[PDB]
């Protein structure tokens, strides 16, 4: 037992922490949208992703290949605009996670366009482990990238992806796997000499427009809090996308509705009609859109040039 | 098509902005406190370096009531209506703003408690002091306690006449910070209550 004054002090500070964290109210600003964990520690990046074009170019010039991680629901809006603007000489492998919910037709269209451009699209499901993904990445490296000059050197892949998409989870999984096998970078397979290099700030989007935030909250990337962004702004956009699709009978069959709804108020009242208030009803609708019982959905549009 | 469901949410919110700016013309004049008024005249001379203007200091508090349409709006709106949350939140915000303007007055006003449901006349500043949670209202409370200690420390016998059981009981009845029946600090503006009942 240490000093009693120190015991009293730690008791007092723990009680203060408890009385500070007892409040269930969540603050407006999404801390997750700006925090980004790395090897040095938790970092907060400010600014958009356009003013970092040369900082991205100087690193994609050093890296051997470009491993990007995006979400299949909204491919283009999650990533880097300068990567799509300026052509990257290095081969790119784009892993679309949560591919079970995206439109199969849009998935084949985007993978066809990536094959036409020179990139390789890999769609990963929840049942698939990261081992098959990293094995396919190794196969891509040994099939596309040329042989290194010196035998001891390794090929580097710059990882571009938001921490909500699964980049941080993949990094942690590979790190723990390597640590358990042996007991700023991350080695995956030592026989082909493949290593990965992460860039937190270049992938952290930071600020976003209204519709961008709507799409991110509908996909589950950005958090949702009552002070900053009510559920109405996102659920009405979801229903507007569903109405632009025009599948009213399909909405009814999915939500177990007596008839095809006419308006958003009608949708809310019909979901309310188990009994629950409109707020939790809209929360359950958004949760349905998150879990993905509604399938073959793509919120991000495709430009004319990518559709050609 | 277009953003029908999005524009409908924006249209209803624009209506709430207009019907609440309309209710501003229905006001109830409340004369400010004597000590608080001199505190605004003092802070104005140091800020603007000029004598205070009778139209800027506003010795009469302009409190705004909730619009007559809004109370009957949430009334006939079913709980299953999605548009009830956006108008309920609009009323909860105005219900607190009304408290913020009410605490600046010191004239006698009807205040009922919610514990034993007793209606009594109280002064809004001293009654709603613990609920409003304003630092300037906290700093003036600490300032007046020192001002009383300065007078009592200069003359100890001054406490005998000023602070007596006859004087202390009289001042508590003059500023009923709690209900004389249930002794509860929780209270409500009766004017806002009767405005909500006869319309709902």
């Amino acid at each position: 037992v240490h000093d009693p004054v120190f015991m009293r002090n730690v008791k007092r500070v723990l009680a203060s922490y408890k009385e500070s964290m007892d409040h269930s109210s969540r603050k407006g600003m999404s801390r997750e949208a700006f925090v980004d964990i790395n090897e040095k520690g938790a970092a907060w990046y400010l600014g958009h992703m356009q003013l970092a074009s040369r900082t991205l170019a100087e690193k994609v010039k050093d890296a051997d290949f470009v491993l990007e991680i995006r979400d299949a629901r909204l491919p283009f809006t999650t990533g880097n605009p300068n990567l799509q603007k300026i052509i990257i000489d290095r081969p790119r492998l784009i892993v679309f996670n949560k591919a079970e919910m995206s439109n199969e037709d849009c998935n084949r269209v985007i993978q066809q366009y990536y094959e036409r451009t020179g990139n390789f699209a890999l769609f990963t499901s929840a049942k698939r482990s990261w081992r098959d993904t990293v094995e396919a990445v190794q196969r891509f490296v040994t099939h596309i990238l040329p042989a290194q000059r010196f035998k001891t050197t390794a090929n580097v892949g710059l990882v571009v992806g938001m921490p909500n998409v699964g980049k941080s989870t993949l990094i942690n999984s590979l790190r723990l796997a390597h640590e358990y096998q042996f007991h700023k970078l991350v080695p995956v397979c030592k026989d082909p000499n493949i290593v990965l290099y992460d860039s937190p700030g270049l992938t952290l989007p930071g600020c976003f427009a209204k519709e961008a935030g709507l799409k991110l909250a509908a996909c589950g990337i950005i958090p949702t809090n009552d002070i900053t962004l009510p559920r109405s702004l996102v659920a009405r956009y979801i229903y507007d996308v569903l109405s632009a699709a025009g599948v009213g009978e399909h909405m009814a069959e999915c939500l177990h509705l007596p008839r095809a709804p006419i308006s958003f108020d009608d949708c809310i009242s019909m979901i309310c009609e188990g009994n629950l208030d409109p707020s939790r009803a809209q929360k359950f609708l958004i949760h349905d859109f998150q879990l993905g019982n509604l399938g073959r959905i793509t919120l991000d549009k495709l430009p004319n040039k990518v559709r050609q | 098509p277009q953003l029908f469901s999005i524009e409908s949410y924006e249209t209803q919110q624009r209506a709430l902005r207009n019907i609440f700016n309309e209710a501003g013309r229905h006001c109830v004049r409340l004369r400010k406190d004597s000590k608080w008024l001199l505190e605004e005249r003092r802070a104005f001379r140091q800020s603007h370096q000029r004598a205070p203007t009778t139209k800027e200091v506003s010795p009469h508090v302009d409190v705004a009531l909730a619009p007559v349409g809004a109370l009957k709006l949430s009334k006939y709106l079913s709980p299953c209506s999605a548009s009830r949350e956006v108008v309920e939140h609009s009323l909860l915000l105005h219900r607190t703003v009304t408290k913020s303007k009410l605490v600046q007055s010191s004239e006698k006003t009807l205040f009922r408690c919610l514990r034993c449901f007793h209606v009594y006349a109280a002064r809004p500043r001293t009654l709603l002091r613990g609920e409003v949670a304003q630092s300037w209202l906290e700093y003036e409370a600490e300032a007046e306690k020192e001002e009383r200690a300065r007078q009592l420390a200069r003359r100890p016998h001054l406490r005998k006449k000023k602070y007596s059981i006859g004087r202390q009981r009289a001042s508590l009845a003059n500023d009923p910070r709690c209900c004389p029946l249930c002794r509860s600090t929780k209270a409500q503006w009766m004017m806002e209550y009767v405005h909500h009942h006869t319309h709902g």
Binding site: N103, C207, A209, A212, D240, L242, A244, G295, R296 | Q2
Partner: peptide
């Protein structure tokens, strides 16, 4: 309900050059 056709047209919403497409920073600066 999983493989049902749900396609979204590009002319219904999210027009190019809109205050919703542009972030609030640029609009406030302008």
């Amino acid at each position: 309900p999983a493989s049902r056709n749900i396609v979204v047209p590009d002319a219904v919403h999210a027009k190019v050059g809109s205050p919703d497409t542009l972030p609030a920073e640029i609009l406030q600066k302008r």
